[PDB]
Paper text:
The human p53 tumor suppressor is a 393-residue protein that in response to cellular stress, acts as a transcription factor by binding as a tetramer to a wide range of DNA response elements, activating various events including DNA repair, cell-cycle arrest, senescence or apoptosis. Mutations in the p53 gene were observed in more than half of human cancers. To uncover the structural basis of rescuing p53 mutants by MQ we investigated by X-ray crystallography high-resolution structures of the core domains of mutant and wild-type p53 bound to MQ in the absence and/or the presence of their DNA response elements. These studies reveal diverse binding modes of MQ to specific cysteine residues that stabilize the proteins and their interaction with DNA.
The MQ-modified structures include complexes of two hotspot mutants: the DNA contact mutant R273H and the structural mutant R282W, referred as R273H-DNA-MQ and R282W-DNA-MQ, respectively. By contrast, the stability of the current structural mutant, R282W, is largely reduced by the replacement of an Arg residue by a Trp residue, yet exhibiting significant DNA-binding affinity. However, crystals of the structural R282W mutant were achieved here only in complexes with DNA, yielding high-resolution crystal structures. The structure of R282W-DNA-MQ displays a large change in MQ-C124 orientation and environment in comparison to the other MQ-modified complexes. In this structure, MQ-C124 conjugate adopts an extended backbone conformation, attaining stabilizing interactions with P142 of S3 and F113 of L1. The L1 loop in the two R282W-DNA structures is well defined showing two alternative conformations, whereas this loop in R282W-DNA-MQ is largely disrupted. In particular, optimally-oriented intermolecular bidentate salt bridges between the negatively and positively charged residues are observed in the structure of R282W-DNA-MQ attained by a small tilt of the S7/S8 loop leading also to VdW interaction of MQ with K101 from the neighboring dimer. New hydrogen bonds with DNA bases, mediated by MQ-C277, are observed only in R273H-DNA-MQ and R282W-DNA-MQ. In these structures, the MQ carbonyl oxygen is oriented toward the DNA, interacting with the second base of each CCC triplet (assigned as C9′ in Fig. 9a and C10′ in Fig. 9b).
Author numbering:
A (entry chain A), B (entry chain A): 94 to 113, 122 to 182, 185 to 293
Write the structure that this text describes.
DNA sequence: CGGGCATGCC
DNA sequence: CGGGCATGCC
């Protein structure tokens, strides 16, 4: 009945974890600082191999309680101003994948983007998905300065939740500057 | 052949001049500082009475040479987020008038808004048009921090130019602050 | 690149 | 209200 997706970490029976200029990641804040329309690799780590047909879904949610029930969408300006697959209303794109699906949920109206889970090749320890955020956090008529989380869910082909992780995202012009400011504020005022 | 409207002051044979918290006007800068979607009265002054059927047209133009040939439009966000007469692409509206016309020029693509010239009633010395700017100067995908001029033209019913005046506009959140900053910068660095 | 400005907002 | 913050940009 809820149209608000869960954000609670569930690393699950497969031991699902995420792994991480243009962008910088803060472990202390569990927060990515990146620039708009520049791809950000996110690593998928598992302790046990997921079943064939496992899928990886990404969905944004507003972090603040007062905004959590509002669907995160691309702002009207960047909707108007395009890879031929992503609907222009979607904030999060996946690059570098031939089986990307974009979902507009018919009941919750939430956007998500899904790709097949590919196990690491023999010799490799993780797999990478190239995400792209098509607005700044500040975009008027879109995120409008409200922080988001990206929720990454590992799902089997039947729809079962296998694992869930999330990280906060700030899409901004100056990731290094803004990261330093936020880490300093955490230490001084958090 | 030109699609760039003239901005040169032409007070003309009728002695046409303009006359002038929510907003403040700087004579030194010939510049209105106002807030978005809040009406701004502009006074029309004439030395001689224009003929019956005279019209008053308002049109925005970018002030900077590198932007002058781009049509000034409402940004996509405020286009989407409405008095039932103004097309949502138009930046400048007129309130308080029953004969407002909105023009999208079929050749130049420029927007303008026109009302009848009404002579001041017996006892009055000027007439007022209530303009409304539907974006901030800063709006992404619209003016995008580029200053505009508003060009007010007094035209007879045949289309003859009777007079022309202009003023710069900054639509902003804090007109009083921004006016003081710009006047100070004129004195210190102009 | 990075310090400072420009500007909606707290 | 007004000083200060938040943030794309110079
Ligand atoms: C944005 C940065 C990078 O360069 C890679 C991918 C995402 N983060 C962490 C590692
Ligand atoms: C995490 C994995 C690896 O083991 C190497 C380096 C980064 N990714 C892809 C290959
Ligand atoms: C914005 C201010 C006002 O209060 C009136 C109309 C426009 N300016 C000058 C006078
Ligand atoms: C300029 C005119 C006048 O003479 C009075 C005061 C302001 N407007 C309208 C009436
Ligand atoms: C802050 C941001 C900028 O404004 C440029 C480009 C990348 N960052 C440093 C210099
Ligand atoms: C600057 C602007 C604001 O932020 C509020 C409203 C009007 N001005 C003063 C206080
Ligand atoms: Zn945007
Ligand atoms: Zn706007």
């Amino acid at each position: 009945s809820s149209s608000v997706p869960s954000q609670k970490t569930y690393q699950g029976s497969y031991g699902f974890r995420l792994g991480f200029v243009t962008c910088t990641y803060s472990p202390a804040l569990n927060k990515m600082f990146c620039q708009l329309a520049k791809t950000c690799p996110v690593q998928l780590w598992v302790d046990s191999t997921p079943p064939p047909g496992t899928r990886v879904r990404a969905m944004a949610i507003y972090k603040q309680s007062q905004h959590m029930t509002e669907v995160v969408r691309r702002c009207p300006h960047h909707e108007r101003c395009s890879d031929g697959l992503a609907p222009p209303q979607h904030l999060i794109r996946v690059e570098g994948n031939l089986r990307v699906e974009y979902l507009d949920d018919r009941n919750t109206f939430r956007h998500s983007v899904v790709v097949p889970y590919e196990p690491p090749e023999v010799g490799s320890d993780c797999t990478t998905i190239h995400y792209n955020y098509m607005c700044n956090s500040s975009c008027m008529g879109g995120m409008n300065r409200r922080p988001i989380l990206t929720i990454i869910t590992l799902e089997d082909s039947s729809g079962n939740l296998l694992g869930r992780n999330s990280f906060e995202v700030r899409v901004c012009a100056c990731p290094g500057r803004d990261w330093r400011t936020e880490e300093e504020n955490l230490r001084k005022k958090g």
